Amino acid sequence: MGRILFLTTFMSKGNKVVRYLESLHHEVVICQEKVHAQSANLQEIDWIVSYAYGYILDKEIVSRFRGRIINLHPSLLPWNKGRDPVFWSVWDETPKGVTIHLIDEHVDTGDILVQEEIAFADEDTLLDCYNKANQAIEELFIREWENIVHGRIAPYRQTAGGTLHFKADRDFYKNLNMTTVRELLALKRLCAEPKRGEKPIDKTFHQLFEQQVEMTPDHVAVVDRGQSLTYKQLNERANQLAHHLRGKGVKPDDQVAIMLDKSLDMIVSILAVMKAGGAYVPIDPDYPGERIAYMLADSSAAILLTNALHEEKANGACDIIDVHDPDSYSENTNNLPHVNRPDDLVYVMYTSGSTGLAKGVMIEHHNLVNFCEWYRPYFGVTPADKALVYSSFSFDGSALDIFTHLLAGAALHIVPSERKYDLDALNDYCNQEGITISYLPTGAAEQFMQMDNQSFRVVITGGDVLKKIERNGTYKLYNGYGPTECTIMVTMFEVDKPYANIPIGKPIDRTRILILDEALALQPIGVAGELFIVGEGLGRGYLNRPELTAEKFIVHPQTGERMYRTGDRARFLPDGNIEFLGRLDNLVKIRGYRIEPGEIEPFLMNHPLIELTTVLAKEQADGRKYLVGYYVAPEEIPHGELREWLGNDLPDYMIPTYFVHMKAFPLTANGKVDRRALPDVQADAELLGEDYVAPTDELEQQLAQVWSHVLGIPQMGIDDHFLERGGDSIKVMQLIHQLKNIGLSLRYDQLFTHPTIRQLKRLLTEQKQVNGLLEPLRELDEQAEYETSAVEKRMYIIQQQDVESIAYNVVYTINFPLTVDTEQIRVALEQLVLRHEGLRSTYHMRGDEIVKRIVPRAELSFVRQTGEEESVQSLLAEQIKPFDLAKAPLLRAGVIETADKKVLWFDSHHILLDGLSKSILARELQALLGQQVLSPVEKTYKSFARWQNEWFASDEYEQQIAYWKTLLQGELPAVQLPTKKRPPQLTFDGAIQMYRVNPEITRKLKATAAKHDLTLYMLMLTIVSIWLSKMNSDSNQVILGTVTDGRQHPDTRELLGMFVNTLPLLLSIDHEESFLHNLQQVKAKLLPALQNQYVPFDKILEAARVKREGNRHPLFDVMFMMQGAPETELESNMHHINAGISKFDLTLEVLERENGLNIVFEYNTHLFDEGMILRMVAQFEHLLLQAVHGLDQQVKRFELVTEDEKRDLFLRVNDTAKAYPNKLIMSMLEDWAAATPDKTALVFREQRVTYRELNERVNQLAHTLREKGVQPDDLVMLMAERSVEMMVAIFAVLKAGGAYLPIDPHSPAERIAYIFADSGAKLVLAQSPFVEKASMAEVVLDLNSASSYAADTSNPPLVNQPGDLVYVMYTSGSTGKPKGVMIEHGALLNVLHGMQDEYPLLQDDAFLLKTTYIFDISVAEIFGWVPGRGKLVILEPEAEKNPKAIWQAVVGAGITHINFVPSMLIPFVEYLEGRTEANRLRYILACGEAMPDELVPKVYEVLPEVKLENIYGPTEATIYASRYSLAKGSQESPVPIGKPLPNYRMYIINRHGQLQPIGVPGELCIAGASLARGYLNNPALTEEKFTPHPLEKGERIYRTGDLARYREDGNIEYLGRMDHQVKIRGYRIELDEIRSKLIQEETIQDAVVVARNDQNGQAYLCATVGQLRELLRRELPEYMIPAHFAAPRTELEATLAHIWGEVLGIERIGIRDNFFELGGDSIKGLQIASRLQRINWTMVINHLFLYPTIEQIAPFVTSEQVVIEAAAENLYFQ
Ligand SMILES: *P(=O)(=O)O[C]C([C])([C])[C]([O])C(=O)[N][C][C]C(=O)[N][C][C][N]C(=O)[C]([N][C]=O)[C]([C])[C]
Ligand SMILES: *P(=O)(O)OCC(C)(C)[C@@H](O)C(=O)NCCC(=O)NCCNC(=O)CN
Ligand SMILES: [Mn+2]
């Protein structure tokens, strides 16, 4: 051992590594600060271990301790060196691992000592990756430190490569810590920089225009009125005016104004200014003369291009150049010399309508060129197109209208104001001129979609929010987005389908869009933020407004990129598109809620009568705002109709107050909807709506005020619906309590039946005011010890089973900015300690009574630590330590400070912190952190315990206990979730998965619930119940637990304590009824339970007398909780932490956050894994969406499996197609014989038959059979034992044309007569001893008489097609008389070809004929040698029962393929153990029954080099269907039947015909090529069993009647027949599991495991009885025990027997009696241990679950050694 200097800056001081070093007995000196070269911490040090050291060691230290400085870097070096390594391992897609290396004089460039490869998942968050990485580096240390310190590890140098990263290189990706890996990479692809851009723009516009004028000189360029201009005519006239302009003084970047109207001269003037060198400044001639003067002066334009009509509007302010004066045009018609550069200004357009007078946005040439060069190839603009110059030339819409199409050879058509506003006449012009492409603003576009157009192929829109996609035309609709500051548009979207929010699209050429937060950091995909524009569209800025330009055009502080601040909110969608979410300022507050009014219009337009809609948010002088819904419809729509229409998907405040009908929306002069021309509502006054009905009496007013107080709404109406206007379950109780003060008693259920004030009055009008309904909580007087509540006693008892358990520790974190004072937070928390007695309460035990003791003051543990992002979790994990309930405060806190945040953490116990208590702690801490004063508390928890303990003596309490005792009487339901194998003892290890319901779906969920008089909890509980039922094999009843607030007295809603109560919920799902029906059923069962919600759970269990198993939890195993929305802002930024704990098998908590729902899936990791839960989360989402849209659909019609799961099943199971030769088997033999005539084909006894000899004898009997009247699909029955004649018969039947029907010769005549009839067959090819056995049925031949053969040895002609019958195998199945399965040739061929592909029988191979030919397996032996041209060794009759003989055949005949039904393989392997003969055997193909798991090793030990295979298949799928290859080193838990064969498909379906997902059981169904034609002469049965199904798209499926389940591997597991299913108390019983467990003991070799119906037709499993139960007590659950198959020895056991008999109540207790079998509860163990402690016998309550008997726990209860003598025994006074 030696001294180690542990260097850590961001990790803990007592990490797992330091402790492992201290266990190996090292002295670990820990230094967290910078060490100096000659410090004391450096003396007498033998090793230096570093872990997250945030300093650099001096070069002397590195050299002085060279080879002795070890670092722990959580990265696979050389990759991701430096800082934040795990994140950069994911973002840069580098290899993943951990490295223990040596420290040099640089950053992580040392010789690697040991290195492991970690693996991160796609569904893992970055935080999960941090945790996984930190563990690996700590385990790698524990695993290799001894090899390192002892020099057993040779350092190898770092390989070439790697990345190096520094601190603050991550400041842009800070909001991405809770994002999954695949999502992180998706954002990277979607937002990263490409490859140094495309190509730089090296051209101006006039340059490219002059190149197009040379390409299409004589094409029409512009068309105004009836006259036209060609490209060359336009170019030359512009060139003429440009020579005039340039000579007049136009220089680059100069601003020349144009005040012309839409004409041919406007296009000439625009190109003239450009060719001269300037930028055109469009001034609309109709603008106010002041606006005109402003632009001219702001633009500092010396030259104005106008005419004589608009001349005087300049007031002599510029050099007027008349565009009609000929002297203004020169004689030079040639292209001017170029004086411009791509960075030169091209135009300046003024934008206004808001703050400021008007700002001049300046655009450059490279900006426009980049747009025009993207426009042409994107829309396929050709010289054949015609475009419309629609927008005013003062708006960038005209830039698109003019410049984009000019660069493509198209023709511009000028639009006079005569048609710009008559859009019927515009459609005329377009249709009669062939206008193919144009840009129409949103409002004008939505009013052009009604016109009937045939000319347009592409119509682009944008400007406002597009809602309408239905149009009377054949043109494509495109939606664009872009500010004027960038060029025209930056994103485009093709509207392909209806959308609620039509995306604005994807960025264009050389343009990138980022969604950033307030700190200018990258938001994750789907998270909203401000849109930022990067690329070649961004212009210079604003004219003479440098402040606003620096404000909106910012260079990013981190990415170093110029970006434009849009001020618009948007989010990226997963497809790569962006969607506009509104302006970051245009949110109004309604009823106290900030909303976007544009989120309402889409729902209103979905009304079948509304075509156009617009929602405005006007206000009154009082200040409050109201929403007005303007709509265009054929006629007016009733107000209540629009209110109801929106009530299906929207909340009350998002429903507009008033609606206004319009015939046509007024449009501004630029194609937008004139919002300020929309009629203002007359009744703005104060009209609380047309729905407002004022209270008409004193009670309606009294109720309306109480409703106002509880709901927060002013002036309620007598028709307002409680649940529709914010009503919650908590608010219902608040209404009830506020009514008790009035004197009126209302029941919880009566509110849901009277949800308006109108109805409530009728309920309460006859009541009389009764005083005393609400009695104050009496403040207890001072005592030494106080009373504890029922929950506090429970929680105490829980923490006593494992005194070191953290399963009920409550850990929350809040991330504060670094500007918060850490000590201020601690001071506030120390104020919260004295403010609440719970934070100073301790719990002790007085005899057998748990009591509370209040302490006047307690000191808080406030640990300050420094850490990094990838270490915060690790630091916090080492701080969750067990709590001693006798010590206060029961809360520990601390602040972890990083370089970007201060993370406050606090850890409490459930005994004090519950749901509401957390919300009060939030609000109070937030108020204290704001230095706000708090009114001192008024009540205390210790008083509520007194009141409630007295209520337990009331009559109401007994009334409620009786409810639960009858509710949970009788056999309760059993919810068998598709879990992993349940561990014997209960485990609490867990993880969490999270599912987010978006705000849109959340809104539809709540609106749906309120509309049908339900709460969101009721609606969620129903979906959860259906979800559980569909996993419990579509059970009709389900059971689960829930949690209530538990605040009985209304005075306890401000206290800090444990109030919540756990309730058992027994609900029912009717799959034959609708979702709406089931919703009411759940409520009809929830409300009675909430009426008896104040009985403690332990008493409910006792009233129900619930049996205690060990694999499951008491009454339920799945828990569903729900929390409301956060009350404060601190509560919304609190984060609950799971320490890897799952109190139940599965817990679902719904949390309302961010206007959506965060659903947590806490699960036991021993029962579910990462993949399983992910499947269940997607199934819940699938059911939720199906339900919220299928309110009236039957629940059976909701499918649990998902489409992704269906595709996954297909590949892993049912992708089995293979092309197989259609040559029949009877031909194959005759072909083989012709080529190998003298090769061995059959071997019987010691005689051999060759292919030629076989074939020839076959041919003879065939020629005989042919003239006997044998044609295709004829049946001739066989009566023969194993011989060569049976083989000749079969093949001859097939050559003649018929099908062969094997009948056992030794079958009773009763049977034969049956098949003789059912088949209706005539020929009976029988052997000599059985010719008369046919009783001369019809024509009976003799296979042994040569008369029944013929002379012709030539191959009979082919007379069969691949669809003809080849054989008919009767079934004689259970509960049935023999039925004839008809198998065709191509069916048999497929199995033979597929089995050969798997187990090929080649020429040098052989099969053994040992299966009786009345079983289909024999067919695989009869024909399995033909494909590969092998041979068949016919075993002697009745030798299948002699393993001696079977073995001999394998040895002497070199057999490779053999079939063995299980139970006949065991006698075979019991013979081969004491044997050593050589073998050629290759495959043991097993089928017929389930393979015992013990058989697999038994086989591979007597026959190594063999390949054991388990194969399954019903007779109706020819022979086989699925197979599973077993391996030597394997221990399959049920031994699966496997995956289907080639061209086979297997489906597991439920009782309603739906594909079951993995784990969920159902009926196995076969489909594919090798299916039976049907049952012979039983078309009834053929219809019930061979049914068409949508899975096979009308093709048939065979219902096997076998229960089966899919496996994560994909292999199907056999679960038995659907009938003959054994269930104890609703749980399925697998008799093999109990047999397997009853066999591994040497004493037992014979294991009988079966069920007997007993007493009232009830069933019970039958097979040392209590010892046998003990052997099965472990491993097996108490529903799987066979119902049918006093001696204390030391003082301790006598003492234990006495104490047990008192607590358990069993007068007679034995040392071998099971605690839980005698009534052992968790309550009992505490009593037993406490009575033992009082007599100095220390016993652990946990031990009672591991050692449940007296003698088993006897050596574990220790004595408390007492000291009898004192230090002072004799005293002498002096
Ligand atoms: P209605 O809306 O149909 O009401 C149904 C309920 C859910 C029964 C309602 O009445 C109710 O009681 N809501 C509050 C229940 C509650 O307290 N939920 C949170 C419970 N969880 C905890 O107390 C702990 N862990 C996580 O929350 C705690 C340590 C924070
Ligand atoms: P014992 O074998 O441990 O069981 C008997 C008890 C009644 C003591 C035990 O089952 C019990 O306490 N059940 C109720 C506790 C419970 O289900 N949840 C705890 C309450 N807190 C939460 O559920 C999380 N918010
Ligand atoms: Mn490092």
Curated annotation (Swiss-Prot):
Domain of life: Bacteria
Residue list for modification O-(pantetheine 4'-phosphoryl)serine: 729, 1722
Boundaries of every Carrier domain copy: 694-768, 1687-1761
Cofactor: how and how many bound: Binds 2 phosphopantetheines covalently.
Cellular component per GO, a single term: cytoplasm
Coiled-coil regions listed in the entry: none
Cofactor: pantetheine 4'-phosphate
Gene Ontology molecular function, alphabetical: ligase activity; phosphopantetheine binding
GO biological process entries: amino acid activation for nonribosomal peptide biosynthetic process; antibiotic biosynthetic process; lipid biosynthetic process; secondary metabolite biosynthetic process
Stretch list, region GART: 3-145
Alphabetical keyword list: Antibiotic biosynthesis, Ligase, Multifunctional enzyme, Phosphopantetheine, Phosphoprotein, Repeat
Subunit description: Large multienzyme complex composed of 4 subunits; LgrA, LgrB, LgrC and LgrD.
Family named by the database record: Belongs to the ATP-dependent AMP-binding enzyme family.
Additional notes on this entry: Linear gramicidin is a pentadecapeptide antibiotic produced during sporulation.
Function: Activates valine (or leucine, but much less frequently), and then glycine and catalyzes the formation of the peptide bond in the first step of peptide synthesis. This enzyme may also play a role in N-formylation of the first amino acid residue in the synthesized dipeptide.
Protein name: Linear gramicidin synthase subunit A
Gene assigned in the entry: lgrA
Residues of the full protein shown: 2 to 1802 of 2273
